[PDB]
Amino acid sequence: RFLKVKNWETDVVLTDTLHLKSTLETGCTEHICMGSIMLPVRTKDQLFPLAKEFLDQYYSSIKRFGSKAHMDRLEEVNKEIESTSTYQLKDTELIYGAKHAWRNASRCVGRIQWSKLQVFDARDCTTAHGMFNYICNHVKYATNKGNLRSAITIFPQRTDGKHDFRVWNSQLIRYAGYKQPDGSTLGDPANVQFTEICIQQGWKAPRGRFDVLPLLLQANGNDPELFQIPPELVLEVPIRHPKFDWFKDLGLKWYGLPAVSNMLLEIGGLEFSACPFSGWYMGTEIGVRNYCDNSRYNILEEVAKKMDLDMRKTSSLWKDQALVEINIAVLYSFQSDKVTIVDHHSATESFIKHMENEYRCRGGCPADWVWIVPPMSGSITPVFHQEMLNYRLTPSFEYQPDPWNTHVWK
Amino acid sequence: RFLKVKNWETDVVLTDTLHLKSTLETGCTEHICMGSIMLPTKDQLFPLAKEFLDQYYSSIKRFGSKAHMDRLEEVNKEIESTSTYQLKDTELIYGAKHAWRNASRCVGRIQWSKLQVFDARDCTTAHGMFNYICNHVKYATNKGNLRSAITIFPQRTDGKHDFRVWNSQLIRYAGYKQPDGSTLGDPANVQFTEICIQQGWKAPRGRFDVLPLLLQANGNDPELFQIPPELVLEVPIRHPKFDWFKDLGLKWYGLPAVSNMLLEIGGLEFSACPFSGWYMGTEIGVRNYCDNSRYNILEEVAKKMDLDMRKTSSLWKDQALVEINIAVLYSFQSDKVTIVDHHSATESFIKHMENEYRCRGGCPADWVWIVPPMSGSITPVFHQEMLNYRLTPSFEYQPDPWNTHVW
Numbered sequence A: 001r002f003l004k005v006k007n008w009e010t011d012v013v014l015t016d017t018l019h020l021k022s023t024l025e026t027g028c029t030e031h032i033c034m035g036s037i038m039l040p041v042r043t044k045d046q047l048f049p050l051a052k053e054f055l056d057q058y059y060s061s062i063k064r065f066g067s068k069a070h071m072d073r074l075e076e077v078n079k080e081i082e083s084t085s086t087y088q089l090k091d092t093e094l095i096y097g098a099k100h101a102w103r104n105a106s107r108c109v110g111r112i113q114w115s116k117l118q119v120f121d122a123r124d125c126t127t128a129h130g131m132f133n134y135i136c137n138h139v140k141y142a143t144n145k146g147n148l149r150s151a152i153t154i155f156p157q158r159t160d161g162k163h164d165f166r167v168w169n170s171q172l173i174r175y176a177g178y179k180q181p182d183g184s185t186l187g188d189p190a191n192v193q194f195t196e197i198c199i200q201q202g203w204k205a206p207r208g209r210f211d212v213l214p215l216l217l218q219a220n221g222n223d224p225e226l227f228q229i230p231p232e233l234v235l236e237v238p239i240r241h242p243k244f245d246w247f248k249d250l251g252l253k254w255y256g257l258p259a260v261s262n263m264l265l266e267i268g269g270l271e272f273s274a275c276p277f278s279g280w281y282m283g284t285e286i287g288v289r290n291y292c293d294n295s296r297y298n299i300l301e302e303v304a305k306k307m308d309l310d311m312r313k314t315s316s317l318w319k320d321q322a323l324v325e326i327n328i329a330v331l332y333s334f335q336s337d338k339v340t341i342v343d344h345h346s347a348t349e350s351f352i353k354h355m356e357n358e359y360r361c362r363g364g365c366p367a368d369w370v371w372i373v374p375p376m377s378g379s380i381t382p383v384f385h386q387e388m389l390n391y392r393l394t395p396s397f398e399y400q401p402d403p404w405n406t407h408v409w410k
Numbered sequence B: 001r002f003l004k005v006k007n008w009e010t011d012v013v014l015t016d017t018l019h020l021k022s023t024l025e026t027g028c029t030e031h032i033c034m035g036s037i038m039l040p041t042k043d044q045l046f047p048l049a050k051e052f053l054d055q056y057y058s059s060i061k062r063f064g065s066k067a068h069m070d071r072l073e074e075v076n077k078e079i080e081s082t083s084t085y086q087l088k089d090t091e092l093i094y095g096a097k098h099a100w101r102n103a104s105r106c107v108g109r110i111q112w113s114k115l116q117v118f119d120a121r122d123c124t125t126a127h128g129m130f131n132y133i134c135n136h137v138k139y140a141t142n143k144g145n146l147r148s149a150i151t152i153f154p155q156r157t158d159g160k161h162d163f164r165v166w167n168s169q170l171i172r173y174a175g176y177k178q179p180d181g182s183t184l185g186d187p188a189n190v191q192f193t194e195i196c197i198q199q200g201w202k203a204p205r206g207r208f209d210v211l212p213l214l215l216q217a218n219g220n221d222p223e224l225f226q227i228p229p230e231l232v233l234e235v236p237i238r239h240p241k242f243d244w245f246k247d248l249g250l251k252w253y254g255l256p257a258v259s260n261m262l263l264e265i266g267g268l269e270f271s272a273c274p275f276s277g278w279y280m281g282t283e284i285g286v287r288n289y290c291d292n293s294r295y296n297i298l299e300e301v302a303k304k305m306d307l308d309m310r311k312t313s314s315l316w317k318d319q320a321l322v323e324i325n326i327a328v329l330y331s332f333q334s335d336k337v338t339i340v341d342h343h344s345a346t347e348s349f350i351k352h353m354e355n356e357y358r359c360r361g362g363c364p365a366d367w368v369w370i371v372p373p374m375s376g377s378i379t380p381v382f383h384q385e386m387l388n389y390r391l392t393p394s395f396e397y398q399p400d401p402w403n404t405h406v407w
């Protein structure tokens, strides 16, 4: 069954056959669409089918489907599962798996880049100190002094779910949030709870507006351990504006490297609960969301005040005006310091080219419109006008509950 | 089976129960979300009629009363012999308001209960339709203090005798392809403009020509009519800060009046049912003015602001976009023509959702449509989870009648 998607700005119509490979469920029904909902131990039984599907895909991509090496590997994986209850991926299969999880990520606008991903195999890691070393090396490699490179570090897979490797941070680099007795927050309000956990575990908090959080790292189901990323490894960009000299005096900065560390990577039925990955920012992530969300740094008031915009009525669009200038400054700052960044026009335009290419050569590109359309200037980016089909392919990155909720303390 | 909806900015969680009353299908499956797709008999009528009548009588808090039953019999008597039935004035007004209440793509529904309904079911001709329409346009315009209205023509019978307004809105601007290869006026209306030419319209060939009405009664051939110019309130577009902005020659009409949809009440089909409210500013400044396939003015506007257009990363498009939208709001405000900005409209919609969850158990809403096309995340609806489902009574799209109608 073929499904059509239309771009309403160009009249380009595309045909999706890839959705027929989708197994996992969307949350939607014939009777209800959950498209705007944020979040809508395996048996040996279910594991070999999942292994088989994955390996069939892998061997098909390398043009060896049904070859002797394909049949033998299926055989070897079967036996390993029966004998040991799990299995180990080859290096080739891990790299392939990790790239495909990225390629399959519906909510990622940056996927044109999917095949250029540096994979760090951390499956020989045994301790939190070992994790910290792996992570520092990833941070250094990915940073590359501002010429950002995409990377993922993959720690050992789940076994019985009692011995998980977890990075407790949501991102490798994030700023502390501090809830004051007067109810105000200092620093990043999104990180209050995790900051509290870090302090509880013995972190001495500087209590500033931009304190880089420590890593809290869980190896082998053990209680997690604190580590401070070497600050010389943390590339930051102070934010200034090309025409507005007063912008610098707001005291804003951001870190160059976006590195998600709380997701779970599924490949051939196996579960890698610690698999931090990083790319580079789209400007709006910092300038719209991090700075301007009401529940985040919330700087709109202060910026419009300094711009002397009319703030007595929403209809002056003082908010929209400030929002643009803040985003201009973010991009100008990164560019000036030669730290890789992409504006939302360029990033969305390249996504459309990617998407079309994926249709022509793969039969589809699952894409989540709610997430792909940037959070400012939506309809002047070409994605707004693009019909998209959202469905779930494996390999995949999934959310997982925060470990402080599930972890059994020793 | 009962569903939670969360607002990620306020941590407010609402529980949706209304969705269990939904009948019609979304286009989604357990395998595939189609949330971003624009368009995804006697035995038949009576369930639909009963279902509707049941909700109507429950709403006037007289459910299971004899008057409720009495109505249920009489409808059933009528379907059995005429193969259709007629709505009472009360049922019609209620159905219309509820089709608005149920429109999951409308941010403006806080207003749903203040809708003036004009019953035009006694209309028989296109001239009749024209008169009803001019009266709607004038009542709704109200010299700039816009009021919500709907005019309802007779219902489908055998579907060979449909009433249709061929225009997509009562008021739109014409579109002309030129020898140049460029487009003059509204590119969205090129085809429809040609259809007007084809039937005798004399076109001024300007950027801003108000289209004529093309009205079909009783499934007869449609006829041309010019809305009296003095009934079409238009706003010239100027900037509170940029004196040069007037030289772009921009204007828009005050009355958004959707005229191509189909109103479904109790299984009955009202193929002509033009309705109108007032604009949210972004509809004009962002979509009408800035869509590449529309008036597409960003290039000119940026040139006049003397912004650096050498690279996307100066955000020159975004800068100009704010300005254009500031100009639309200022112009409507200075002329006292009702308009709402996207901050105010989305704030009011959040308050409306909260009301609907509280007093009705839910509110169907299409995030893709509800979130404005600029500054998405600085409006509160961006952070609001919404459940999308199809309730009846309902407004639906229907195929353009020229593809359908036989001459």
Ligand code: HEM
Binding pocket: A098, A101, A102, A105, A107, A108, A109, A110, A111, A113, A117, A150, A151, A152, A277, A278, A279, A280, A281, A282, A285, A342, A347, A371, A397
């Ligand atoms: C190369 C530059 C990249 C850019 C510009 C980019 C861009 C983005 C953006 C803007 C989002 C939405 C995030 C948000 O609004 O919270 C996103 C989500 C996502 N990206 Fe990418 N990305 C890049 C690289 C990568 C890499 C290397 C991976 C993994 C290998 C990845 C996987 C994902 C996933 C799984 C999501 C969804 C996250 C969630 O649901 O919270 N991206 N990306």
Ligand code: HEM
Binding pocket: B100, B103, B105, B106, B107, B108, B109, B111, B115, B148, B149, B150, B275, B276, B277, B278, B279, B280, B283, B340, B345, B369, B395
């Ligand atoms: C009173 C002020 C109103 C406001 C501010 C408003 C706002 C809007 C907006 C912004 C949209 C998105 C349209 C687009 O982006 O093309 C929309 C769609 C819609 N509105 Fe409302 N509206 C109002 C009155 C009404 C009334 C009176 C009705 C019906 C009686 C109505 C029914 C609808 C329907 C059915 C849609 C979906 C149209 C489509 O799918 O193309 N609106 N509205």
Ligand SMILES: Cc1cc(N)nc(C[C@H]2CNC[C@H]2NCCNCCc2cccc(F)c2)c1
Binding pocket: A038, A039, A110, A258, A259, A260, A277, A278, A279, A280, A281, A282, A285, A399
């Ligand atoms: C690898 C990469 C590159 C890039 N440019 N951008 C990214 C997303 C990161 C960075 N900027 C935002 C952050 N987003 C990742 C985490 N998102 C929270 C999702 C969430 C929240 C609550 C409930 C849910 F069900 C889901 C990753």
Ligand SMILES: Cc1cc(N)nc(C[C@H]2CNC[C@H]2NCCNCCc2cccc(F)c2)c1
Binding pocket: B038, B039, B256, B257, B258, B275, B276, B277, B278, B279, B280, B283, B397
């Ligand atoms: C009543 C009212 C008030 C208001 N503010 N705004 C409105 C929507 C109107 C006006 N501004 C745009 C227009 N929207 C109605 C037409 N929308 C096109 C939808 C469409 C297109 C193509 C294929 C599809 F399947 C669907 C109505």
Ligand SMILES: C[C@H](O)[C@H](O)[C@H]1CNc2nc(N)[nH]c(=O)c2N1
Binding pocket: A035, A036, A037, A038, A370, A371, A372, B008, B382, B383, B384, B385, B386
């Ligand atoms: C409720 C809504 O689904 C939620 O706020 C989503 C909307 N779109 C998004 N898109 C991106 N890229 N990132 C986000 O955090 C969100 N939030």
Ligand SMILES: C[C@H](O)[C@H](O)[C@H]1CNc2nc(N)[nH]c(=O)c2N1
Binding pocket: A008, A384, A385, A386, A387, A388, B035, B036, B037, B038, B368, B369, B370
């Ligand atoms: C492809 C996508 O569904 C399409 O561009 C939609 C997106 N959201 C929209 N939202 C509104 N309010 N109006 C529109 O016309 C659209 N277009």
Ligand SMILES: [Zn+2]
Binding pocket: A028, A032, A033, A034, A035, B028, B032, B033, B034, B035
């Ligand atoms: Zn859906």
